Structure formats: C-alpha cells, structure tokens
Amino acid sequence: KEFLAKAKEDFLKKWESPAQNTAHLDQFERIKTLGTGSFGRVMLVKHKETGNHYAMKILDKQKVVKLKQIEHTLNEKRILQAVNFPFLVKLEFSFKDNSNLYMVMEYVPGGEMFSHLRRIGRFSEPHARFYAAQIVLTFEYLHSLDLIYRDLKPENLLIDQQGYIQVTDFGFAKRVKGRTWTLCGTPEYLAPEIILSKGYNKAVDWWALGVLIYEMAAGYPPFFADQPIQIYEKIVSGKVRFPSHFSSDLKDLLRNLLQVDLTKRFGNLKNGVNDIKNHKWFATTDWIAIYQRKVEAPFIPKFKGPGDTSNFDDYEEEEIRVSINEKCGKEFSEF
C-alpha cells in the first residue's frame, strides 16, 4: 500500500539534518548559461574531477534579500536536498561563497517542456497524459511529505534522455501542515484562492495540474491576457472554454481540476489523488510502469553529444563575480 511510508522516513531524516557545504566553485568548469531569472542564473558546468556535467543554479544573496526571498530560498535547498523521486531533479551538491548561493543539480539535456510545446504547438492527448501521469505521481509524493510545490509550468519541467520529465525549481516549495498565505507562483497557473487571498493548501497544486494539462493539449493556457490583472479576473470568474478537439473525458477531468470549489476540486476530496488516478481520461495509464519508467516515451530529445545544449536557448553570458567581503552571512547561515 503505502510506499509513501518508506519515502517519508527517508525524507524526514534528511529534513532534520540537511546536507551542507558539499563542494566549492573551483571544482567546476563553467560552460554556458541555460536559463535566467530573478535572483540568478543556471549554468552548464563540468565537474573537473569526474568530467560529469551538471546544472549549477547561482543566486546572488543581495538580490535574494532585495526580493524578500530569503526564507523561500532556504526552503528550496532544504527540501530539494531531502527529496527523492524519479521525476524530481536531483541536487548533487550545494555551497555558498561571499556573494552567491550555489545549487549543483543533475543536467537534463532534453531542454524544457516549454520549448518543445511552443515549437510543436500542442501535444496529443496520449502525449500530454504521459507527462501528466508523471506530475500526478510527483504531487502525491510531495504532498505526502507535507510539501506544496506551488510553481508548476512547462518552463519548470525538463525532458530527459528517456523522454520522461524532471521537475525543477523548488524556489516556492514549502513544508507546511495546514494552510499558508503567500502570494507567489505564475499568473496563468494560480488557483482562485491564492488570487483571492483566502489562505490555501496543496489543492492549489491540483488546480495547476489542470492548467498544465489544458495548456499541453490545447497549446495555450485556459486563462491568458496581455496583463496579469486581466488573467486574474478570468481565473476568478468561474468559467473555462475548451478546444473542440478536446475529448469528453479530458473536459470532464479539467472541469474537476479547474474547480473553484475546494470541496469539489479533484485531489482535494475524500478520495484524494485516487480521484485523479482513477479517472477515465487516465483509463489507459499503468501508473506503476510510469513510475518504473517502463512506458515508452512519445518523444525522445536529440542531443549530438555530451554537454550539448542545442535544446536550450542562448542567453547573454555574465561573469560570476565573488566579492572580497561576506554578504548577508547571517541571513543564509543554514544554507
């Protein structure tokens, strides 16, 4: 029954005695920027002593403070070092220096789901169900450890060499029993309760699964507009439109996931996630073979070699400068 039992015992031990300071910058060769954002970037690096390639996330401590993301940042690394699941990107090392925080993760060369979805336009329902299944298993794992993920989007899902998903960016992930209130996430993916400040729980993640699945199958999100305020008005308004190519089952799933009514939103009711797992739209899914990676991927990325980055966009390179004075040392003490 509860595979989660074992799971949780291993997580809790890592959670209370988290790994710290397990490498240093000079052990890595910087190769290229794979992505960028708010408090820092993600770089392809090469581990000098093994020749392994990694993805190194760099956060400027001063910028993290300025954006009021200190706690979120400590959350991110504490949780990511403690979890373990086939569709969750692995944290190999972490450390910090005078200026930055570093999280050295598994390199996933297939690029972002985002890139292939926009390029291809939309996915086939079976294709989208393959990915979705992976997220349904990941969310039941995460929620079983009392974690909210809070940042689901194709931009955050990487495609591996086998065509399976790896979830990245735990910048908003949080271990919380009960409910929480932070306004965070991505406008297209927010649940009604977040926008309305009602206080919320892991149900927000199940809505987000509703947005993802829709976006994947249709090629655009269920709620979009040129500015975020308009997007909130749409989400809050209780109304969704579906492409005529959506199959009946899929509309029914989505109607239950993009459920403004917490008491009726799927994954949030008495039967939990089995309400999702048992749905007819997932009728042809072997949940077990999906976990064991025994299903055949719809799509397998092309990479002309190791450390090859054609599946990622090009970003302007910037130098990693390290100050001679320690910055915000007390704020990031436990990192």
Binding site: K153, F172, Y220, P228
Partner: peptide, 18 residues
C-alpha cells in the same frame, strides 16, 4: 481563433513567477 489570439499575445514567452 484562440490559438491566433494567444500567439499574438504578449505572453507566449517564458513566464516570470510573481
């Protein structure tokens, strides 16, 4: 079409979290 509206919208690139 909704797809055409999307594509012409200012949100088809990577979306920043809030």
């Amino acid at each position: 079409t909704t797809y055409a509206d999307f594509i012409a919208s200012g949100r088809t690139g990577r979306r920043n979290a809030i």
